[PDB]
């Protein structure tokens, strides 16, 4: 039962919105189908599987998938995206009566609902010497994305979402740094489209 296709290596969903991760298969005879999840740093965990019993299969945590042979699909859904759903998901199929073959995987990114954005660029100092520092772009919403650096002596990370449980509060950030004496936090993110109201403390 030859292939299984997942569409998009990286996909986004709004926090609180319907999760939907697509999988299709090619196999004339209906195959068994599997959805695995892999949280970072970890192994694979089976969420649910279609084994020719219920076509609507329920799994742990509100995950479900419907097998639909008429459009050779087995799309995974969950009714509401939580930050803890950030992971890579793999659809898989039985093949040649002897093995499971894996789709390429899709990573789910959950965009936090940021009701009061407070974009800002801050400067942080090494705890052991005033002279080394980094720049932190933080507290922008989902409409901002950070661009890779212009200049090969300036390093800029991808945006990252942290979830402070103590305050039920999530925020985006990216980090930039350079060893050049030319380097200023005011200019660090000049290759990014930032909010017009980004705070730049003196």
């Amino acid at each position: 039962a030859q292939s299984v296709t997942q569409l998009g290596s990286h996909v986004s969903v709004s926090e609180g919105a319907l999760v939907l991760l697509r999988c299709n298969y090619s196999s004339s005879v209906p195959p068994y189908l599997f959805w695995y999840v892999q949280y970072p740093n970890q192994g694979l965990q089976l969420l649910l599987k279609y084994t020719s019993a219920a076509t609507l299969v329920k799994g742990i945590n509100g995950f479900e998938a419907e097998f639909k042979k008429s459009e050779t699909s087995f799309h995974l859904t969950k009714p509401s995206a939580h930050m803890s759903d950030a992971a890579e998901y793999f659809c898989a199929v039985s093949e040649q009566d002897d093995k499971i073959i894996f789709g390429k995987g899709t990573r789910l990114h959950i965009l936090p609902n940021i009701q009061n954005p407070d974009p800002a660029v801050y400067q942080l100092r090494d705890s052991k010497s005033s002279d080394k520092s980094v720049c932190l772009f933080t507290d922008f919403d989902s409409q901002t994305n950070v661009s890779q650096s212009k200049d090969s002596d300036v390093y800029i990370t991808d945006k990252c979402v942290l979830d402070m449980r103590s305050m039920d509060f999530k925020s985006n950030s990216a980090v930039a740094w350079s060893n050049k004496s030319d380097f200023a936090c005011a200019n660090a993110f000049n290759n990014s489209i930032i909010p017009e109201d980004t705070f730049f403390p003196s």
Partner: protein
């Protein structure tokens, strides 16, 4: 079974013969070796239905296997090359696709062990302007100058490992992207209330577990031998 794999982490030079081992306790006829690479999923290398049976999967070139017992299925890299750097997963199946995976072997193949290097780690303390504007405080950890890209970063507050308020980059960046053997760097943030940062009793540590050379490996340089090790950096809260 309890499916168990060894080793859990390994770094090797190119051109060496390397052995991975899977053992199970349930005695399932079917065992499998896969590798996992970003964007490619899990690809089958070889599998076996009994001691007398070996079948190729999609990427069997460069590898061999032996099914020495009902319980054991060995994978070999015959002569390791860098593109065999990957996460490797053993699995067993019952007769109804009930798979059990082992927890993984992270393997890195490097051309030249002379280029191995542990990270330098620094913690950057929260901005006062952040503290004033938001009443929150974001620490930033930076690990730089390490090779290969085979580390684990964690945060420790008053001696315990914390997960809340942490975001670590998923992938390190290349310090010299033009070079095949560029050193790497990685960043992480830990955000706390200003209140908690402001207390001089609280201690914050960024810990990086680095995987490199073992006690066995030859080392000819004057600089420190770059053995598997932990490198931390730290900061204490402060009122001002």
């Amino acid at each position: 079974a309890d499916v168990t794999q060894t080793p859990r982490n390994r770094i090797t030079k190119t051109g060496k013969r390397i052995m991975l081992e899977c053992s199970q306790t349930k005695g399932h006829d079917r065992m499998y070796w896969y590798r996992q690479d970003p964007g490619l999923g899990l690809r089958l290398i070889y599998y076996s239905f009994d001691v007398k049976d070996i079948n190729k999967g999609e990427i069997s070139d460069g590898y061999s296997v032996s099914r020495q017992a009902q319980a054991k299925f060995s994978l070999s890299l015959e002569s390791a090359i860098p593109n065999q750097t990957a996460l490797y997963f053993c699995a067993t199946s019952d007769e109804s696709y009930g798979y059990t995976f082992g927890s993984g072997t992270r393997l890195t193949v490097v051309e030249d062990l002379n280029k191995v290097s542990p990270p330098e780690v620094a913690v950057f303390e929260p901005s006062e302007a952040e503290i004033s504007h938001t009443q929150k405080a974001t620490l930033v950890c930076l690990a730089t100058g390490f090779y290969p890209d085979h580390v684990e970063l964690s945060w420790w507050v008053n001696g315990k490992e914390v997960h809340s308020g942490v975001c670590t980059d998923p992938q390190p960046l290349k310090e010299q992207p033009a070079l095949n053997d560029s050193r790497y760097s990685l960043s992480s943030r830990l955000r706390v209330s200003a209140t908690f940062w402001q207390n001089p009793r609280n201690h914050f540590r960024c810990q990086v577990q680095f995987y490199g050379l073992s006690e066995n490996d030859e080392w000819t340089q004057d600089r420190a031998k770059p053995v598997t090790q932990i490198v931390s950096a730290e900061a204490w809260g402060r009122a001002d």
